[PDB]
Amino acid sequence: APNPKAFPLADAALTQQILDVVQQAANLRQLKKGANEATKTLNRGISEFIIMAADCEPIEILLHLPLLCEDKNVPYVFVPSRVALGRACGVSRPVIAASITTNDASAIKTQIYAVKDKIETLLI
Amino acid sequence: RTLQKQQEEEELKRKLKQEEDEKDKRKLIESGDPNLELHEDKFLLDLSKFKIYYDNNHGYEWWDTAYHPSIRYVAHPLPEKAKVSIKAYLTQHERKRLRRNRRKMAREAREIKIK
Amino acid sequence: IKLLGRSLQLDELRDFFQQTFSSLEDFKISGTERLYYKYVNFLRYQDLNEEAIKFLNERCLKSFPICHKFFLQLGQIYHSMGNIEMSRETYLSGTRLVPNCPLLWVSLSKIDEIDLKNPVRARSILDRGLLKNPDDVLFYIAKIQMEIRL
Amino acid sequence: MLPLYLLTNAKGQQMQIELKNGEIIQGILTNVDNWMNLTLSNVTEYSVKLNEIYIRGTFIKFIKLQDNIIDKVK
Amino acid sequence: DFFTPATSELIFARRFLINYSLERSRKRLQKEMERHQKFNTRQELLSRRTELQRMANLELAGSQLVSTKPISAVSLSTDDMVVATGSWAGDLQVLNSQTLQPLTQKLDSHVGKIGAIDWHPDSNNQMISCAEDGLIKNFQYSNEEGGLRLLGDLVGHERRISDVKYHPSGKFIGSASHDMTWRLWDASTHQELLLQEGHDKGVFSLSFQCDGSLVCSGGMDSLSMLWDIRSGSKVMTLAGHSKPIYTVAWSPNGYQVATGGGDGIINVWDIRKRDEGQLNQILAHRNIVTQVRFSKEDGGKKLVSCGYDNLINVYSSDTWLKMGSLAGHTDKIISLDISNNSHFLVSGGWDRSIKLWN
Amino acid sequence: RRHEDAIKRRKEAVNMNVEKPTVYHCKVFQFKNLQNPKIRFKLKMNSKELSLKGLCLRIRDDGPGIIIVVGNEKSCKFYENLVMKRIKWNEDFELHTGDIKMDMHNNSISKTWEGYLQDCKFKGWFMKVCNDQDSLLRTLGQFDSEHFYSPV
């Protein structure tokens, strides 16, 4: 298992859907990669939801975020592989945390609310 | 014939009103005494079922009726447990590089071929 | 009414009021919502008469009652003379009659926290009203203003 | 197929009925019987607007159907 | 391995559990005997419809903000004196039930997001709490002394725990962890005796039957396995859920079980009938189900459920139908608990505020 | 040519090999009045297009009824979109026979349920009318789900 600590962690199918939204919003410029820009989106409050990586090491550097996500009441999930995550973000270098941000004019908004809803299902 | 028919009709009509009255009476009984539409019948406990059930249990409950099980040991059984196609995206750099390589292969193939 | 109101003339304002109602013998509640509201509003501007103002909003609020401006003005009757129980009850019946109106819930929670005090009742009020009508933003605005006042 | 069966499959369709008196009756079909007795809606006649009319089957000369009668029917 | 451990400390306790669950099984079923003996359709159905009408007529009473993060755990103490509430930034506070003003000062105990919190059944004001850390903690509380004074500090698990409960005897504390194992504890020496692997994923919930006989364990495998502490083996494997089981609760009578799943369908299992009519499925909430509770002192017969839908809904033990939907939560409802007398409901959620119903 | 070859690939690709995905997304709706034929046509045709395993029941025609839909999360989501948003249940519609105008302001729609359930027992989407709530609950009972319909 990808660490005992990191929670929640989606399955292969929902991971596939979430990564699909990652690539899509990445094509719509509605995504912000990286832990620092994820943190910036959380502080600004424009973040729809946070994706993070399970296989990353060390895990703590991604474990600073869940506290901030629970503070701002924003959903977050853990895709298993940072290589697949950044690969979906469109960067060869593996990305650990990505953030789907808010756009009122976005065409994928409904997709973001559906995936976000399933994320809130996972959160517990 | 018409008269007989008429009479029959009248009789039929008469018969319907009694049924309506009976239905009203049933509703009245239902307000203070069960409603099937609301499944209120399910609140009724069966003296026969529970009695023959407990006698079949011979006192106590179906859990401990075996009191046969082994206290001495503790079971740890049956750690009981779907392929999903992995879609690998990739960079605009590797899309441009990929298309450039493919069109380079086709281009050199047609060029050297026609040469 | 705004003019003679600026000039502050009691006899011509009152006589002109009776003239307005005599013209309202034609009834059919054309624009009268703000007519009664400005009538009770200047009859508020005069310090006295507040009791016949109560009866006034009892007959008018008895006729119209969907108004929800009369519930605010009457909550300003009992809050003006300082009746916290009377006010509160009138805001309760008000919110029961007109759930779509934010100002009644907002004022209700206000008089809750300022007068009877406590946070609890007020937060409950704004929450229940919010989930009564999800559409209007003025309710979220109400919870935010209440919280920032806390 | 059978004409009566076709008028059974055809319900609520505009058509131009020819009668023996020579008067056009343009209407929308409603019900058909074994005697092909026709009842039409939104009826207008030529030598008069009518909401409904009863038509005897035996008095009919010929019936001008819509062209889609085979598509809408079958 | 099957049946490998000896568990010496267990047998001495397990026989206390066969005596305990034996006598309370006979006594409880005897109370049921008198009840089914003496009831009748008239004051049975009229009183039932009356209580259900009351729950349907409940409405939001008050709310008190507590923590910076959401309130994960809401539990009413015996005789509904105070409510213990844990949050995701670990802190747990008790609040007077009716006035809802916080009695205790802020207390930071658990490092991770707090899991379930329960009160000791004997009314000793000892509240057990679980969290993301492997620690589960006993907290002795008093009306006025100060704060909360912890007694036991227990590490039974590696990964995050989820639900800890009290055995009705009060001498055992069950703990369900995201580990394959769910464990049972002593309220005296604070040591392990039962450790169970029933599932390929974590066991997210435990529920002790009110007579102390059987533990229904909701897993994340979408299987809720019923384990006799005394038999040491599962009685039955019943899974109606396609998604992880996020709560489980026993009716006061063992005649009914309620498993809230991640499907939003409450699977109500009647285990008195093993081969027929086991499950009565219920459609609970738009999104999944968070916590399920029973009417307690009423002898069950009334259920109340909360989930990520903003509604808290009520049910009956027979029709199992929606009597009414309870608004008042602007956002997700992660925890719910019922007054012993069943009059008022106390809940918490991502609204980060406790709420009441009167 | 690529267009025709794609139409052929889709035509042979209708059934595919696809197994049961499980993960059945289920939303049951209840409605006061379905009398508008347009609505029933939309339910039939849309259910057939989206291949939604499910059903639509009603009590004594104009009386209230239930809608139940099962299938892919996306397809069922679109179905909920057409039922809630696209379909206007508050409306006037006339029965074409003469015509009889039925004006329903009171007829509305609400989603009773949304959620996953394992092992859908619906072999297809079967609409039916039932003269009484009892035979309706038996109609739901042949699929061994009584609980989808909750009377209020």
Swiss-Prot record, chain C:
- HAT repeats span 8-45, 48-80, 82-114
Query: What extra comment accompanies this record?
Result: Present with 2250 molecules/cell in log phase SD medium.
Compartments in which it is found = Nucleus
Full protein segment contained here = 601 to 750 of 899
Q: What is the protein name for this chain?
A: Pre-mRNA-splicing factor 6
Q: What does this protein do?
A: Participates in pre-mRNA splicing. Part of the U4/U5/U6 tri-snRNP complex, one of the building blocks of the spliceosome.
Q: Assembly and partners?
A: Component of the U4/U6-U5 tri-snRNP complex composed of the U4, U6 and U5 snRNAs and at least PRP3, PRP4, PRP6, PRP8, PRP18, PRP31, PRP38, SNU13, SNU23, SNU66, SNU114, SPP381, SMB1, SMD1, SMD2, SMD3, SMX2, SMX3, LSM2, LSM3, LSM4, LSM5, LSM6, LSM7, LSM8, BRR2 and DIB1.
From Swiss-Prot, chain D:
Q: Where is the Sm domain?
A: 2-69
Localization terms from the record: Nucleus; Cytoplasm
Q: Which domain of life is it from?
A: Eukaryota
**What does this chain do?**
Component of LSm protein complexes, which are involved in RNA processing and may function in a chaperone-like manner. Component of the cytoplasmic LSM1-LSM7 complex which is involved in mRNA degradation by activating the decapping step. Together with PAT1, the LSM1-LSM7 complex binds to osmotic stress-activated mRNAs to attenuate the osmotic stress response, probably by limiting ribosome access to the mRNA and consequently translation. Component of the nuclear LSM2-LSM8 complex, which is involved in spliceosome assembly.
Assigned protein family: Belongs to the snRNP Sm proteins family.
What is the annotated quaternary arrangement, including any partners? Component of the heptameric LSM1-LSM7 complex that forms a seven-membered ring structure with a donut shape. The LSm subunits are arranged in the order LSM1, LSM2, LSM3, LSM6, LSM5, LSM7 and LSM4. Except for LSM1, where a C-terminal helix crosses the ring structure to form additional interactions with LSM3 and LSM6, each subunit interacts only with its two neighboring subunits. The LSM1-LSM7 complex interacts with PAT1; within the complex PAT1 has direct interactions with LSM2 and LSM3. The LSM1-LSM7 complex interacts with XRN1.
Miscellaneous note of the record? Present with 3440 molecules/cell in log phase SD medium.
Name of the protein in its database record = LSM complex subunit LSM4
Recorded name of the encoding gene: LSM4
UniProtKB/Swiss-Prot annotation, chain E:
Q: Name one GO cellular component term.
A: nucleus
The keyword NAD belongs to this UniProt entry's keyword annotation:
no
Subunit arrangement? Component of the U4/U6-U5 tri-snRNP complex composed of the U4, U6 and U5 snRNAs and at least PRP3, PRP4, PRP6, PRP8, PRP18, PRP31, PRP38, SNU13, SNU23, SNU66, SNU114, SPP381, SMB1, SMD1, SMD2, SMD3, SMX2, SMX3, LSM2, LSM3, LSM4, LSM5, LSM6, LSM7, LSM8, BRR2 and DIB1.
Q: Which UniProt keywords apply?
A: mRNA processing, mRNA splicing, Nucleus, Repeat, Spliceosome, WD repeat
UniProt entry tagged with the keyword Repeat:
yes
Q: What is this protein called?
A: U4/U6 small nuclear ribonucleoprotein PRP4
| Full-length numbering of the shown residues | 108 to 465 of 465
Gene name tied to this protein: PRP4
**What's the superkingdom here?**
Eukaryota
Curated annotation (Swiss-Prot), chain F:
Locations listed in the record: Nucleus
Spans through the membrane: none
Q: What does this protein do?
A: Participates in pre-mRNA splicing. Part of the U4/U5/U6 tri-snRNP complex, one of the building blocks of the spliceosome.
The misc remark on file is: Present with 432 molecules/cell in log phase SD medium.
Q: How does it assemble?
A: Component of the U4/U6-U5 tri-snRNP complex composed of the U4, U6 and U5 snRNAs and at least PRP3, PRP4, PRP6, PRP8, PRP18, PRP31, PRP38, SNU13, SNU23, SNU66, SNU114, SPP381, SMB1, SMD1, SMD2, SMD3, SMX2, SMX3, LSM2, LSM3, LSM4, LSM5, LSM6, LSM7, LSM8, BRR2 and DIB1.
Identify this protein by name.
Answer: U4/U6 small nuclear ribonucleoprotein PRP3
Q: Which organism is it from?
A: Saccharomyces cerevisiae (strain ATCC 204508 / S288c) (Baker's yeast)
Within the intact protein, the region shown is 314 to 467 of 469
